[PDB]
Amino acid sequence: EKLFTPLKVGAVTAPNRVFMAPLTRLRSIEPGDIPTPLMGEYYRQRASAGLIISEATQISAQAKGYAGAPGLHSPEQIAAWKKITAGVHAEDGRIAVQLWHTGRISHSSIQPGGQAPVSASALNANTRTSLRDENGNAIRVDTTTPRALELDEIPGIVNDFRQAVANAREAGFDLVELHSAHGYLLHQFLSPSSNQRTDQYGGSVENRARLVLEVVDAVCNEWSADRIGIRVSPIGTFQNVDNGPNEEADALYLIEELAKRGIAYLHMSETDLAGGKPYSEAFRQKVRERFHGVIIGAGAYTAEKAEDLIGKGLIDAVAFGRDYIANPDLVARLQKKAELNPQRPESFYGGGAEGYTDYPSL
């Protein structure tokens, strides 16, 4: 077994390879998109993870696409996150913040000024996001057709990522994870299906990857490359965003470019919840030869699959999502070969302590 052995992840040393995947839970305070002490407790309970990767967190108000998702742009958000990271550190944990801009997976009612959300192109996501009703409960709503960003708006987006990383470093996070997956803004630019631009940010794969690589360079310069991770979902379809007709080649291009920056990690979300074709071993080998940081695999993993791929020298760590919702001490359970708590999906999104901080340890 290698799952319970340490791993250097950029500037941080994880004591094991069992990571907590980023999990949107939609329990922040509105107004202000403010993290809470309840969220702090939840993270503290999971501090034995080799690395906790937070719920996706807004870089800006414009970045918001879900009612109840937290931000990391305001003073009050910074102050609330500082308490949360301090609590994780008091338990000897490590925590990365996942930073997103939701782009077109959003709704005008939760945008600044009530305006249409932004994207690479003016194309509806054709999916749903989560708002809150008059009683504060999560509800699904169809996404609003976005406005295509103007060329002169792009530097501001890059700056918003940079600024949120300054704020994250201040707030006590150990690492940042850029959310370049699952059909959010960065992935909207990467995918030819969502990006129909004919300027320097669309068309060729170099142009489609331009924004994400400008963001990577800005955030490495703000902090350090060894503090930056990135999540990608570059093979298959995620929330109605496919990866185009040359998905493997285009993925390898991006990964070779990322490798040049010497970033801490590449986190590959391999499948959505409905599943699909596994990554080929050949593809995993191509990724591994091109990237010289930590590789984290995710998506309906088992401990056995993680051990197998780590043993094969293809990945370094695994991120578990749903099993971490339900098992605060997932590390101990996997180490001991104990049963896993029963999941309660009705309380994944929104609400309070129930289905959030009430899953027991062994």
Ligand SMILES: Cc1cc2nc3c(=O)[nH]c(=O)nc-3n(C[C@H](O)[C@H](O)[C@H](O)COP(=O)(O)O)c2cc1C
């Ligand atoms: C409730 C819920 C919230 C999620 N939130 C995020 C998120 O904030 N960021 C992200 O990149 N993926 C998110 N995902 C995907 C998970 O990180 C993970 O990739 C997915 O659940 C598949 O892994 P699993 O089989 O271990 O659960 C979410 C998944 C679920 C079930």
Ligand SMILES: O=[N+]([O-])C1=CCCCC1
């Ligand atoms: O950011 N994400 O990937 C998700 C957020 C909430 C819905 C599930 C996917």
